[PDB]
Amino acid sequence: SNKCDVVVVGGGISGMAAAKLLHDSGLNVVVLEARDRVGGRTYTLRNQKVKYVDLGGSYVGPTQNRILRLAKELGLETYKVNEVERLIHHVKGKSYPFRGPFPPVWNPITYLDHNNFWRTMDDMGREIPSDAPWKAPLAEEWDNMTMKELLDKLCWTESAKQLATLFVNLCVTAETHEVSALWFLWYVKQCGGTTRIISTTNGGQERKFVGGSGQVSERIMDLLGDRVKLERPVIYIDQTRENVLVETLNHEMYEAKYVISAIPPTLGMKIHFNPPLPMMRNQMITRVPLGSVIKCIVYYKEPFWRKKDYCGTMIIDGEEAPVAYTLDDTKPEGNYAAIMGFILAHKARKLARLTKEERLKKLCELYAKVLGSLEALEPVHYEEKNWCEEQYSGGCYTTYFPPGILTQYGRVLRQPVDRIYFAGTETATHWSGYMEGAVEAGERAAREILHAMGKIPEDEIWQSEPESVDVPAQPITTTFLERHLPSVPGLLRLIGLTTI
Amino acid sequence: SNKCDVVVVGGGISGMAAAKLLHDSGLNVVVLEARDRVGGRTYTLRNQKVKYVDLGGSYVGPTQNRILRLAKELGLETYKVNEVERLIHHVKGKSYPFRGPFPPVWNPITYLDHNNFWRTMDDMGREIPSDAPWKAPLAEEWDNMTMKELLDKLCWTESAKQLATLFVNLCVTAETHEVSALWFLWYVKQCGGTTRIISTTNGGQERKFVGGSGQVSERIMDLLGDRVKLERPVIYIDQTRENVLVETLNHEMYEAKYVISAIPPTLGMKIHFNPPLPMMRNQMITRVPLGSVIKCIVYYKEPFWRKKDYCGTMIIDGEEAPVAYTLDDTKPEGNYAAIMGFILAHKARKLARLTKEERLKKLCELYAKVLGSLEALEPVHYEEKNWCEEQYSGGCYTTYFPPGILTQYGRVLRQPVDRIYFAGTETATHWSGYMEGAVEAGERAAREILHAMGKIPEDEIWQSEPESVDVPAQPITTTFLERHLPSVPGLLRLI
Ligand SMILES: *Cc1cc2c(cc1C)nc1c(=O)[nH]c(=O)nc-1n2C[C@H](O)[C@H](O)[C@H](O)COP(=O)(O)OP(=O)(O)OC[C@H]1O[C@@H](n2cnc3c(N)ncnc32)[C@H](O)[C@@H]1O
Ligand SMILES: *Cc1cc2c(cc1C)nc1c(=O)[nH]c(=O)nc-1n2C[C@H](O)[C@H](O)[C@H](O)COP(=O)(O)OP(=O)(O)OC[C@H]1O[C@@H](n2cnc3c(N)ncnc32)[C@H](O)[C@@H]1O
Ligand SMILES: O=C(/C=C/c1ccc([N+](=O)[O-])cc1)c1cccc(C(F)(F)F)c1
Ligand SMILES: O=C(/C=C/c1ccc([N+](=O)[O-])cc1)c1cccc(C(F)(F)F)c1
């Protein structure tokens, strides 16, 4: 057996952040990675047509201070996603250009319903602890309904219900009827709320890395040298003896004091455990699927949309549209002009049937209609990735919880199992599901093991992160009217009262 | 490498039934079983205190003709679960004895609501094809709601809603909010409807095997001898070459023409595939969990409940009771007196933190209240099994489908992947979830391979089963009033 202090299972950002922290603390670490590459749900493709393109996780933004600090220490820089010109909301076959993060509504009743929907998402979120969502006062009531049921109760207009549906599909790559209401309200609150999660400027989609996000994992592999073992899928973990034994598919054995599991929770099923997992984890890892998404990038000779005063952002409502959301993916130098689009949830399953050429044609025909531009029918290049086909991811972006699961099984997600500690973005308390959460969880898991070894005290396991000086966060603010305008049922109550 | 015609992954009833059919046709089969035993979600324990006890699947009944034919060929006999005396419904802290399968109600409003609930479950089922529930006319509408939402719409009384909730929890060991309405309605319809699934006399719980259901898998292992490899968990299947390669955790390699996967669908995740699975199966096997149950058997000196004209069946409403359902588990001779109870769904997770002795005390105090007998506080022995703990089952009785999954992924469950064919009770079209469905699926998967080999024609893949002579089925009937009484909103629309 190959002997070390800590085996890290998985070479995504979480496992690589864990391994780097442990290596820097003076321990002997090994990273066992299933694939022929590091990065996991991040993947930067390089070729002469695109130069570089992120086919997995890409965007970072204000309040994501751990990924920004890690990236800066590795010599990486960010640039801003194009948001100079107007955004587009496409609804019932017509485009409506706008500014600001939320598509606006003019109809007064519809205005009250939209304002109440976003306000209520955040009001409910403030009842949910980031590190223990199952402790919310109405946790059981909220966990026993789907997001579809919650929107059916909250939304008194079809306009608000259709926009809210798109919001859920785009944030968690799942249908409203698939996901727990408690879990979704937790997910949004632990990113900083509705405004922060949906925004480009001042939110999650503000920036990208120059050269691609894959460089984070690659530059940590460069620091670790031969400690990273590629094409080593883990099949077996044995904790019955003094040292833990970790076996790989290609017949290698590793012996360690501790293990970090840095893989999505359900992919723990690919490992045979001795002794067996405790009952709650044994069942939890069969109850937590990942979402469904195809990330599609169409290349053009020029960013022609900018000449019509469109920034390249499209919010597209309708069953017929393959893509519900786009962003400008042009390089910061203004060349390799491109539109990035997501095919979400059921549409990722429905359209996986088509050829790559048939998906390109449907996307160009959609963009031509939304942008009112025949130039969208003249692409120069296309790249895509369907994350539903990945054996060692299971989907993208992240793990969703169906109704009933987070209250019954959520407490064991990051509970150690003897000498196994749990990393991965799913175990984060701030931007869980993102590259930020991967760093939070990897570093926290590594510090749990440093505490188990008596190298640090208990109060150093969870550490706050200084604010980035490069990516300052503007606060989220509301207006008097946003806070105090009545809901549609609030207005109806006021009318009933007056006429009495 | 060990060379054979077919590798069967899993030595439960489905894997054993498939291997026996292929062996009987003259093919060389190997069964690779992860555990140090056969039987899977069936397990019969023997000791002097119990003689034998089923800690997993146990009951068989009319219309389950495949498991009855297979067991009879292996030399097994059945006996009837005791249902001579009265059943008990325990409601708001009081026992109400009754006869006939459905607990009765006396309030006229509650009567219409209960009648409408059971009638509506069977009316919806008549629109769901057994072999393709995703082809129901309202498949998307029904798949996109939980059973909790359907019961909220249908049940105008708390009485009906609480009994419907117990019905879901008992049939599929899951909460009403965890499961798809389309999947649950399919599940009931594919067992023959509400009356057939809930009934002891003339339904699924009519009989048990003399000596235990574990004897089905054990006696097929006896026939196959050293073709059954115990403590061989499969870790890797490679289909890139001329022959399929199957590797085990203990470093053995098997080479075959074809493979049968006879494991619960989600336990496919414990196998690394080359090439990778197709996208829809890759995601499906992460979306299909198994239910949660503790099966508990309390032993007594005598079947003392019979002296009060109670048969030992208890249907126990409410959150406080650990056990919602019991049957008499006494042996056919009247000895080894026992009550079998299920701790269901969230209660299995809540009460697993207790000791074995703490669960025994809670069960004995519950039974003393419901049976109105101090004799229930004097157990002579106790056996239990928590199926939530099993690495190579994932739970019991079977796989449930959360909202949205059956319509999006259901078509993939029995679709072959190159030279891998899929067995397991989850792939059956009649009593899927049961030992009957295990036999149907294993024999169908085996005949798909015989057809691929050019040994039988396409029309012999799916084969009907003659009715058992020992366990004939009586027709399910309804009354004029059951068919025509209005619902509660029906009675209101008339007013
Ligand atoms: C896929 C995707 C993700 C994504 C996104 C868009 C798409 C299409 N958009 C994002 C964005 O703009 N900004 C952002 O911050 N996140 C975005 N996401 C999500 C993001 O990519 C993920 O949150 C993050 O990358 C997760 O990192 P983590 O380290 O937690 O997980 P991982 O990347 O999945 O790495 C796990 C590794 O483990 C290996 N593996 C799996 N099984 C084994 C076994 N048995 N043995 C050994 N290794 C194993 C995987 O191969 C992987 O490398
Ligand atoms: C657990 C349970 C089940 C049950 C029930 C009560 C309980 C507590 N009551 C039932 C009843 O009264 N009547 C009835 O007909 N069924 C009842 N059930 C369900 C029933 O037991 C199951 O439907 C049936 O036993 C399923 O059989 P099947 O053959 O489909 O599946 P299995 O028993 O799970 O067998 C699978 C085998 O595969 C092995 N395994 C798993 N992974 C591997 C790998 N990787 N490699 C090799 N072998 C593997 C398992 O160990 C198992 O033996
Ligand atoms: O929810 C959004 C975006 C979310 C999001 C989340 C994650 C990722 N990603 O991980 O890449 C991208 C977009 C989002 C954006 C603009 C408008 C709206 C709308 F208000 F619903 F209209 C919603
Ligand atoms: O649904 C039942 C039984 C189901 C059942 C299903 C499976 C098994 N098993 O696999 O052991 C046992 C009982 C059942 C029985 C009697 C009364 C009721 C009630 F009407 F809901 F009250 C329901």
From Swiss-Prot, chain B:
Keywords on record: Acetylation, FAD, Flavoprotein, Membrane, Mitochondrion, Mitochondrion outer membrane, Oxidoreductase, Transmembrane, Transmembrane helix
Gene Ontology molecular functions: electron transfer activity; flavin adenine dinucleotide binding; monoamine oxidase activity; primary methylamine oxidase activity
Membrane topology per record: Single-pass type IV membrane protein
| Known EC number | 1.4.3.21, 1.4.3.4
A GO term from the CC aspect: mitochondrial outer membrane
Q: Where is this site: Important for catalytic activity?
A: C155, C364, H381
How's its activity regulated? Inhibited by deprenyl.
Keyword Protein biosynthesis attributed = no
| Cofactor(s) the record lists | FAD
What InterPro entries is this protein classified in? Amino_oxidase, FAD/NAD-bd_sf, Flavin_amine_oxidase, Flavin_MAO
| GO annotation (BP), single | dopamine catabolic process
Q: What reaction(s) does this enzyme catalyze?
A: a secondary aliphatic amine + O2 + H2O = a primary amine + an aldehyde + H2O2; (R)-adrenaline + O2 + H2O = (R)-3,4-dihydroxymandelaldehyde + methylamine + H2O2; a primary methyl amine + O2 + H2O = an aldehyde + H2O2 + NH4(+); benzylamine + O2 + H2O = benzaldehyde + H2O2 + NH4(+)
Cytoplasmic side stretches: 1-488
Q: Summarize the protein's role.
A: Catalyzes the oxidative deamination of primary and some secondary amines such as neurotransmitters, and exogenous amines including the tertiary amine, neurotoxin 1-methyl-4-phenyl-1,2,3,6-tetrahydropyridine (MPTP), with concomitant reduction of oxygen to hydrogen peroxide and participates in the metabolism of neuroactive and vasoactive amines in the central nervous system and peripheral tissues. Preferentially degrades benzylamine and phenylethylamine.
Protein name (record)? Amine oxidase [flavin-containing] B
